[PDB]
Each structure stands twice: as structure tokens, then as C-alpha cells.
């Protein structure tokens, strides 16, 4: 296999998904240089689980899944096994036995706009926590108390998604961050994704 893995279209995509509707790209039958990314000064997080980041280029996997979305700076800590909060609980959840890497970088230049970018959403309300790698894109009015809602927004009856408001001079904790989560999958099948 000579062809390079299409990481450019993952990391350099013009637009990223909302976290609640996080995107998944399957990577396979290709060669990828993880070290070039790890050793760059571009990322604020490059932290791996079940595998050493400095050993990634020596390994082969059956599939690599690249999940990507935007959150705000103070939420990057929630993208890890065992974490709690709105993002881990209701939006994107990693398993305890996660084998992969979490990669994040500040995206203020791209994802904020004067006047405010309000297109990136997260789920604020949900009945129960997501299971690992579960995705929820439903938009039913959430009942927060005893009175049924009958689909009517109101007191204790909340639309479940909420926009981030990304404006360029927000504090860093409230600036947008792009996140790529790589899942390294080893099946009972030949490996097709290796380093160089």
C-alpha cells in the first residue's frame, strides 16, 4: 500500500460538525504519518489511550475511525474516558477501554465571526447519558418536571439543543476548538492502515 491516508480532509475540512451531530470518517487501506502531526506545534491536545503516541507510526490497524466536531475550549478536558459534563454525558462519550488518540486545536480564526457564529450546537438536555460512541440527533422538547409538554416549548419544557456563540474576542475558554478523535480498531481481519 502506497497511498496516503486522507487526513487532510479530516483535519483541514472547511467546516466541522456540531458536537451533538459529530462526524465519523472511516479510514482504511492507506499509509499515515502520525508522528508528523504529533510533533507539530499546531495542536493543544494530542493524548492517546491504550497506545503510545510516539509508537503510532510502527503499528497497523484494520480500520481507523476519525470522529470530529467543535466544542468550546473549556470542554476539551471532557473528551477522554471517564469524564462527565454536558459534552461527555449528552453529546460525545468515549468508553473506559478506549484505544485511540484525542487531538484538539484552537479554531477561533476559522469558526468565530464578527457578530457571532451561532451555527455550532450542543445538546443541553437529555433523559440519560449517552452510551459510548452513541449519537443523538433527536430534537424533541425535553420534559424537565412532572407536567408533560405535548411538544410545546415552555416552563420545564425545553428545546434540547443550544448554540455556542463564538465571537472573535471571547476568552480562550469560550473560543471554539476543533477536535479529532482517532479510534484504532483491530479486528479478526488483516490490517490495512499502517505507518510509513
Amino acid at each position, epitope marked *: 500500500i502506497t497511498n496516503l491516508c486522507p487526513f487532510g480532509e479530516v483535519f483541514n475540512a472547511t467546516r466541522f460538525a456540531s458536537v451533538y451531530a459529530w462526524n465519523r470518517k472511516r479510514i482504511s487501506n492507506c499509509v499515515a504519518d502520525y508522528s508528523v502531526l504529533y510533533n507539530s506545534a499546531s495542536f493543544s*491536545t494530542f*493524548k492517546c489511550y491504550g497506545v503510545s*503516541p510516539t509508537k503510532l507510526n510502527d503499528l497497523c490497524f484494520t480500520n481507523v475511525y476519525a470522529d470530529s466536531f467543535v466544542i468550546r475550549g473549556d470542554e476539551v478536558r471532557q473528551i477522554a474516558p471517564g469524564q462527565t459534563g454536558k459534552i461527555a454525558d449528552y453529546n460525545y462519550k468515549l468508553p473506559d477501554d478506549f484505544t485511540g488518540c484525542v487531538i484538539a486545536w484552537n479554531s477561533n480564526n476559522l469558526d468565530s465571526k464578527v457578530g457571532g457564529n451561532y451555527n455550532y450546537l450542543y445538546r443541553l438536555f437529555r433523559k440519560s447519558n449517552l452510551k459510548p460512541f452513541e449519537r443523538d440527533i433527536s430534537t424533541e422538547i425535553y420534559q424537565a418536571g412532572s407536567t408533560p409538554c405535548n411538544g410545546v416549548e415552555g416552563f420545564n419544557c425545553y428545546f434540547p439543543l443550544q448554540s455556542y456563540g463564538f465571537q472573535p474576542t471571547n476568552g480562550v475558554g469560550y473560543q471554539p476548538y476543533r477536535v479529532v478523535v482517532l479510534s484504532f480498531e483491530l479486528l479478526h481481519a488483516p490490517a490495512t492502515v499502517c505507518g510509513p
Partner: nanobody
Amino acid sequence: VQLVESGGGSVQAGGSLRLSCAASGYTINTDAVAWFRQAPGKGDERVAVIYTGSGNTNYADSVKGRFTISQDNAKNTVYLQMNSLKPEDTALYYCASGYYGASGYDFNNWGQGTQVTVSS
């Protein structure tokens, strides 16, 4: 734990300044503190890192030899001393603390940012 930057301002090219990244608490989970800079037209750059236990330091090539990162654990503060400033050093500078170890790095506690302006 909250991070608060100070020391921002405006100086002319060739000049010098010092930024400070003051932490309110003292978390022991902080293995490293990083200074980033943000400017239009390019991705944010991690220009300097100091490892809290040893004081070892790593710099981006863009600032090596001109910037010095250091730390004072008694004040829970990390400094960035900037000499020989150039206009291309103009940026919003912001600090972060986080994990650094065998699993990689994860700068996930954020300051607010302070502007540095270098004028010809």
C-alpha cells in the same frame, strides 16, 4: 484552577516585554504549562512549554533564542520573557496548563489571552 495572563502591551520592534500566567490554585495534575499565540491568517502556534517538575523547556523554531519561559512555583506563575521582538510576533498570547507524559500532552486549562503588539 483559574489561569490569568498579564503583561500585555505595545512595544516597538527590537523591544522586549514579559507575560505572566498566574494560576489561582495549585493542581498537582499540571505536568506542563504552554504559551500559545493567535494571529489572523495562520493556525495558533504553541511557542513555548515548560515542564513544571524539572523546568525543562521546549520552544518553537519561530521564537527559539529570543523567548524564555520560566516558572515560580511559590507564586504558581509561569513567565514568557520576549526579547528582540518583531512585528510578526504580534498576536493574542494565551497560556494553558495540562497533562504531559507517556500518553502525550493535553493543554486543557485555559487563560483568557492578552494582546501583544509590536510596531515598526
